[PDB]
UniProtKB/Swiss-Prot annotation:
Heme c binds at residues 13, 16-17, 93. Binds 1 heme c group covalently per subunit. The keyword Signal applies. Belongs to the cytochrome c family. The keyword Mitochondrion does not apply. Cytochrome c2 is found mainly in purple, non-sulfur, photosynthetic bacteria where it functions as the electron donor to the oxidized bacteriochlorophyll in the photophosphorylation pathway. However, it may also have a role in the respiratory chain and is found in some non-photosynthetic bacteria. Keywords: Electron transport, Heme, Iron, Metal-binding, Photosynthesis, Pyrrolidone carboxylic acid, Signal, Transport. This is Cytochrome c2. One of its GO terms (molecular function) is heme binding. GO terms for biological process: photosynthesis. It comes from Rhodopseudomonas palustris (strain ATCC BAA-98 / CGA009). The lineage of its organism: Bacteria, Pseudomonadati, Pseudomonadota, Alphaproteobacteria, Hyphomicrobiales. The modification Pyrrolidone carboxylic acid is found at residue 1. The chain holds residues 26 to 139 of 139 of the full protein. It comes from the Bacteria.
Amino acid sequence: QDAKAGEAVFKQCMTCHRADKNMVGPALAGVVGRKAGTAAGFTYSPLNHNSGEAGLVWTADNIVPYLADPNAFLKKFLTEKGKADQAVGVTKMTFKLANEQQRKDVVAYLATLK
Ligand code: HEC
Ligand SMILES: [N]
């Protein structure tokens, strides 16, 4: 949860994301503490959208595991809500970051965007 170390990790994330505009992925400023799937202007996959509508909020403790396996995390979330029938299919332009500390750190960095 070292935000400054997270800035470096975020350079990897900038392959697809920016803070303040949509790109391959949605803009991330304000993502921490927000309902999943609700960055203005971005067209989410059914899986990323459906998870937010089922009550997924991007708290730090949700973003950190998500970043290791977006499809698995989202499906697990929906399945535990008894909504496995909304979890069919996969996310867009899927990226996985295995390193746990890098995930923790970049999530602290995301909180600095707003
Ligand atoms: C392109 C290959 C990506 C890289 C590298 C990273 N992300 Fe990403 N992210 C990408 C897309 C296309 C999407 C939307 C997927 C969909 O199916 O709609 C996302 C989504 C996120 C989210 C969820 C945002 C929301 O508003 O619900 C988060 C929190 C996120 N991405 C963060 C993130 C970070 C911190 C990354 C670097 C470690 C990163 N992503 C890389 C595409 C890509
Ligand atoms: N992502």
